[PDB]
Symmetry: C5
Subunit: 395 residues, 5 copies
């Protein structure tokens, strides 16, 4: 029953056969100290060529072997404040950081590793390796793990790798298409036969129940478009596009930085609590931003970019939310809504209601279905500002 801004702002394109294909270019250079990954929503995997940045694997350029080694790592997720390794415990895993920041405290907090960093190199070769620093995850993120035993097995598999390891001991174009499959929001509406036979003259309680069902389906559509793992702007956004606040509250400097990272930003999406926090920051700074009109409707904006409320963005127990800056379009590579119309029996252009059966208890069943998905044409189309403290007040 709430306002659905993402549904009415994202353009909808018609897929054929319930599938879509997006061609991805992944530019990456070796030697720069950062490992680049391939991300498919929430599932991530290291680029096989990038894997060569590791010294113990430098100058090895057999595509088969690198691909196998890349395939044998395991993805793990860590929450804020969770301890991953502890000082004193023997080291047996190589950790490649894909997202988040992790502060390492030695026996003296050395520094904080971030996206593209590695720790655990020496643990791979010798069995005497011991963790001398404690890594505490300051921010939630992902991390790839390469076990010593698996790499040893791969070494015992390829003779070329043995010889290269024994000898050492003494812009790249990568095309890989991404396939999007239409997800379904489905439900069963059970209407008693009496309610369909009698209550049908001045208003249809069947039609009113169907409208309520459609509204619930649309709310689920928005919640999935925001929070789903395979597709979904919160999770299926490039790791480089996700920024951290300088101080924690959503100061206007953070909004300027969020607008810096991409061209032609269309709008901001944030929780209403987050919008209140941004307004508090604006009042503290003493500036009054203008409001712009979209569709004959006035809306708060920053630098002319409208800020739209979305209640489906989660609020963490620590009262920290996130802000999304995103451009929409097909001619300009942005975010599109994949949706198939022309269904066999449409109550609405995107909907399909079909009579299922009548039970022995005289209850008619209807199947209400809609098919939807989201596509991001280029990586630099959605930026996310994370860990935004929304419970800060002037003191």
């Amino acid at each position: 029953i709430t306002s659905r801004w993402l549904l009415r702002m994202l353009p909808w394109v018609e897929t054929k056969g319930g599938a879509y294909r997006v061609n991805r270019r992944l530019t990456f250079t070796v030697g720069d100290g950062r490992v680049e990954f391939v991300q498919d929503g929430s599932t991530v995997r290291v680029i096989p060529q990038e894997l060569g940045e590791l010294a113990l694997l430098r100058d090895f350029d057999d595509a088969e072997v690198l691909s196998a080694i890349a395939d044998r790592c395991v993805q793990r997720d860590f929450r804020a404040g969770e301890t991953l390794v502890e000082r004193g415990t023997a080291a047996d895993e190589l950790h490649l950081i894909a997202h988040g920041r992790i502060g390492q405290a030695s026996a003296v907090t050395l520094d904080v590793l971030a996206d593209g960093d590695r720790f655990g190199e020496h643990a791979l070769l010798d069995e005497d390796a011991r963790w001398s620093q404690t890594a505490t995850a300051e921010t939630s993120g992902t991390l790839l793990t390469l076990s010593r035993a698996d790499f040893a097995a791969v070494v015992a598999n390829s003779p070329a790798l043995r010889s290269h390891l024994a000898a050492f001991t003494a812009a790249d174009y990568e095309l890989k298409p991404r396939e999007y499959e239409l997800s379904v929001a489905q439900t069963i509406l059970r209407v008693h036969t009496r309610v369909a036979d009698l209550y049908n003259g001045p208003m249809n309680q069947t039609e009113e129940q169907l409208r309520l069902t459609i509204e619930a389906l649309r709310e689920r559509q928005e919640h999935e478009l925001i929070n789903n793992r395979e597709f979904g702007l919160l999770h299926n956004a490039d790791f480089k596009q996700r920024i951290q606040t300088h101080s924690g509250p959503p100061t206007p400097d953070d909004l300027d930085e969020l607008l810096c990272r991409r061209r032609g930003t269309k709008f901001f999406l944030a929780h209403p609590r987050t919008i209140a926090a941004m307004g508090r920051e604006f009042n503290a700074r003493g500036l009054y931003p203008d409001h712009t009109d979209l569709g004959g409707q006035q809306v708060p904006a920053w630098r002319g970019v409208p800020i739209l409320p979305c209640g489906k963005i989660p609020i963490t127990p620590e009262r920290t939310s996130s802000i999304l800056a995103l451009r929409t379009g097909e001619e300009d590579q942005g975010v599109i809504g994949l949706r198939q119309t022309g269904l066999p029996d449409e109550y609405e252009p995107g909907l399909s209601v079909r009579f299922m059966n009548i039970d022995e208890k005289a209850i008619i069943s209807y199947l209400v279905s809609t098919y939807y998905s989201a596509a991001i044409l280029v990586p630099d189309a959605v930026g996310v500002l994370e860990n935004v403290q929304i419970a800060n007040w002037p003191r």
Copy 2:
């Protein structure tokens, strides 16, 4: 003779038979530590299922018994600074807080209870119970009271309750329609026959007196729409929608919070003194808000939402007022004005003037009547910011 903004901004819908029906959904979950209530204007009553949050009544799920227990509590109102219970006095009542904040000072101010809180649990079971804290009401509000004797009587009534109590000693959907009945503003206009016979050529003093009567009736309509107890935005507003100022003056952060709680806010209603206080806060913060045009009329606004003056909002002796943020509409669930037109003898579409009789003293009597009421379709349509200090000046 003053401007009537609420009369000209609230849409008016035609009721049939002088009555209206509003369907209410009351979502509530058990175990979360807050008791949810059903509010009909100023009269409040505890939800029978919510009553189960009490430990001494946990796991009892007989609808009849819970309904009876809920029916046997008494609603009481407390003003700011009034002491409800005192330390040392024996405890004999269970108090469930429906609105307001109450600070409890022990023998050391422990904390402040708020809406949905309970105190007086142990007073229900044993007669030795004694109040060890003094509860001072910092803000005016309501409170439900459950006496020990009444609960004991209910226990002596239901055998199932006795057995459950003896054993312990060792999202829910609730539909309940709300009915609105049209209220009447009526008056008698006494015009002497001489004034109707002679003073009728160039101007009608009868018609001028009728216009003055109509203006007085409209002023009474506004005062009732604001301050009435059964219906009326000040009292018939959800307890969750009523917020307290962070500091006491109406700072722009408070306005941002007031706009946060509901979607598509239409306008603000405040006393002109309150508007002056808000302007003083704006000048202190150094920001100059824009002004928007409604009906070809310029008006001060915040974030594009016009702020309309209403002199019918009371000012307390402590010089504290309240602000109302409210959206209006029928297609969008908001606040509507129930009014019946097509009266038997209409001087105006909503009015009815009828000749009553002529007295022995040659005085003609006229009956001027109008029928009006207010409906709030959804709970999240009117928000109230309370205890707004309007007598604060820079120092």
Copy 3:
């Protein structure tokens, strides 16, 4: 030759017979500690019923006697810093404050009396009464005086008053119409016959002298509309509508307060020096108010209400001026300009130039006349902010 904003903004209505009638309602309640007065421009008189607030006259309700007592008081005006009574001097007068603030310093400045206050009660009864405080007028204002001898004479006149005094010793509706008489701005233009006979071909020096005469008459019209005593916005404004600045400079908080007191304010009138002071305050506060267009002409405004310069508002030697906030209209009760057109011989719709005579010295005389006045339909139509310090600069 200057811009005449009041002439071009005040609507002009046509009076019949050179007179106008305004019906006044004066609501007043007894017992509230303030005495209400009837004001006709600069002449003020106490309401006879209000006079009952005095204890020594409480419960006396003979209309004739109260009217007589009210008629026998004398109005006096006091300037800022003038001492009215001195400590030690015997008290013989009862003083009722109608306007201004007066600080009383005892043998220790007790407090400051204001509009509606009384001091000198006991001086009325006994002859031993002595002034024990010195009253210094901090602000210019008026004051009603009731002498002991006059009240004693009235007592000796009415037997009922004697009995009531001897016994004690042991919302009201009052209609009183106000009549406005059109004032005249007149002058005599003396043109030599030679100047009318010769200098008439390419330009008329007679017509140029007439235009200069008309401009002088219009300037006098504005000066009288502002500064006249009988009519005139500066003096014929309600004592409750006149406010004092919180600090002395015209801070924007003062403008907000000035806009608070009345509905639908049309514009502000202030001296250009006052406008410069307001701009200095705006710059100090750091806010830049918008400008609005009236008649295709841009003008500075506050909260959308245009601020118009008027050089006829006096500047005191202490460099303190006043600001006027006023709404104009006839359908909305405000300030109207009474003016009669259709004169026997009109050079202009409101003007009348008539040949008088030719002197023996061959000098033609012309009489240039215009008739004008101002009416204030309701008391809450003109508000005045007084003692505005306009010579304050940042330091």
Copy 4:
């Protein structure tokens, strides 16, 4: 080649016979301690009646004598920091201050004399008079000087003056028209005959040289309109209209004061360096002024009054400039541009190019001439803010 704002904004009126007449009213009252002067550009002369403010000449009212005495004073100009008189030197001159401020330091800086002040009274009568204070000119200005010998000669001329002096020893209307004569910007363009015979097919180097000549003439026109002594806004502006900055940088308070002194100001003229300084002050104060559109062209403005750049306003070696606020028009008494069109041989409506002769060296000569002047109808049409420090930066 630069933008010429004054040329395109000043209205141009056609004079007849190359001359214009402006009628001046000079209101002045005696006894107020200030001497009023008549200014014709840069040449100033004391009003004969005002001369009576001097005590030694009080009550003498012979028009011939006063006119003679007024005629026998000499005008002198002083720069900032220049010492005019020194302590110890015998006093022999009476100095009347027409413009600027001069600080006098005694044996202790007494005070600062300003426009309309006098010093050197006693030096006129006795020969023993000695300067006991040193007068240092803080600001550039003018000063009238009356020598003792000249006044003594005038005394020896008029018997009436002798008798009046011997006896003492024991609003006025003054019309005086101002005549404006059109100035000429002239030049000679020498084009070789070969350049006129050959280089004439695809483009005319003769026509290109003529366009360059016209541009140079227009630049000279602007420089004279700004900086000329007889006419010219910088010098031919009323001494009362010239203000001094409160602090030295062009703070917005100074702009408000500049707008205070005259009605209907059209625009500001300042050097681009001065505009940069004003922008720096605006940024320091934290306010962002709006921009207005004239002729479809956006331009910075203050209070809706556009600020136009003019590079012809001089910058002193001390990096101090001046700002001009001026209204333009003929129906509203302001600043007009006198210019005669319809010349015998016009290349442009205001221009005249005429063939002069061909030299023996086969060089054709052309005479390019334009006639222009400026008129100020009323004294209060141009205000000048002087000694504006434009080299101030935040520290």
Copy 5:
């Protein structure tokens, strides 16, 4: 694939024969202590007449000799922090500063030389000369060098110079046209014959590859227009138009100064990181600049001048960038884009794709060519703000 603002904002003019001619006037006066240079992109050369400011060459006015001496100097570039001369090392070179600032530290940092300064005079005459100060280049710039031996050779060449040197020992107009030659962006597109024979029905992969080639060519066009040495706004901008920030971050005062130096500025060009830094400065100052619409597109602006992002402006390792303020036009002397259309075989108005050959390996080759250049009609058309710190955050 990024937005190309410079391509769509610069007007394009059609050159004839692939060449353009710009007539330059170089006004310079002798004796003012600054040497003026002639700049052709990145190549600079001293004006021969200006060379006379040197004392050892004063009063020598033989054009041939001065031209020869000017021709025999060598241009050198210095980076920030690079030491050019060291104390103690013998002096053998005369250094004329053309751009940048160089701080000289003696045995005590004396001062900082800047554009037009000279150091090394005495090194020219005697061989005993020794550097007594160390010159450290605080900012990158250019510098002309005149060796002692070369000047001695020129002296031994001209007898007149010997005599003038022996004797001493005891606004100018200079026209020099600038020629612009069109540069070419060329590439070869290799398409396999199979891809051209089969993949041609529903979409042409040949046409898609051609579009990608065109986009790459346009990106190279922008990068050359910004960063090229011969032409290019960053390098081919007048040395007087290049300003240094007062503090280092791009404060609004710096933008005001950048707008001060030229008339009718069209737009600003800066890196998106620089735009973020400017927004941070605006938020710190507390002012919110307006946004203007160009081509129906909203864009941030300062004082109404739009600020356009350009990613081709380099960012130094010290995180310092530059800002460009530039006006565009042909009728108003500014920056124009030289481009020739009407090519023999145009895929696009400015493009030319031509079939080259088919290789023995059945690979078709296409030649994609475009011709472009940039012209700056007057020196005061592009201003550059340099060393702008873009990594500054509030602390």
